[PDB]
């Protein structure tokens, strides 16, 4: 096909952009789970590496 890509080619960016927001949610939820474990354990003071 000599004719160029249709507007659907921009859907690659839309698809990517939605994945970006989804990654933010997954990171948020997984981060909260990791924090829950740290605060559950005996870590109530600032420190590097916890």
């Amino acid at each position: 096909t000599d004719e160029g890509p249709g507007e659907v080619v921009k859907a690659l960016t839309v698809n990517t952009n939605i994945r970006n927001s989804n990654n933010a949610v997954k990171r948020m939820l997984n981060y909260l789970a990791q924090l829950r474990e740290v605060v559950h354990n005996g870590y109530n003071r600032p420190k590097f590496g916890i």
Partner: protein, 37 residues
């Protein structure tokens, strides 16, 4: 025929399809503000 009725010509409403997404949405942007690297 005796009755010639339109069973083949029809109007077409040509349904639109308009979708968009920003680099990240308001929920993600407020929680994880964008920094360009």
């Amino acid at each position: 025929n005796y009755n010639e009725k339109s069973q083949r010509d029809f109007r077409v409403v040509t349904i639109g399809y308009n979708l968009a997404a920003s680099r990240q949405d308001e929920f993600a942007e407020r929680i994880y503000p964008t920094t360009v690297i």
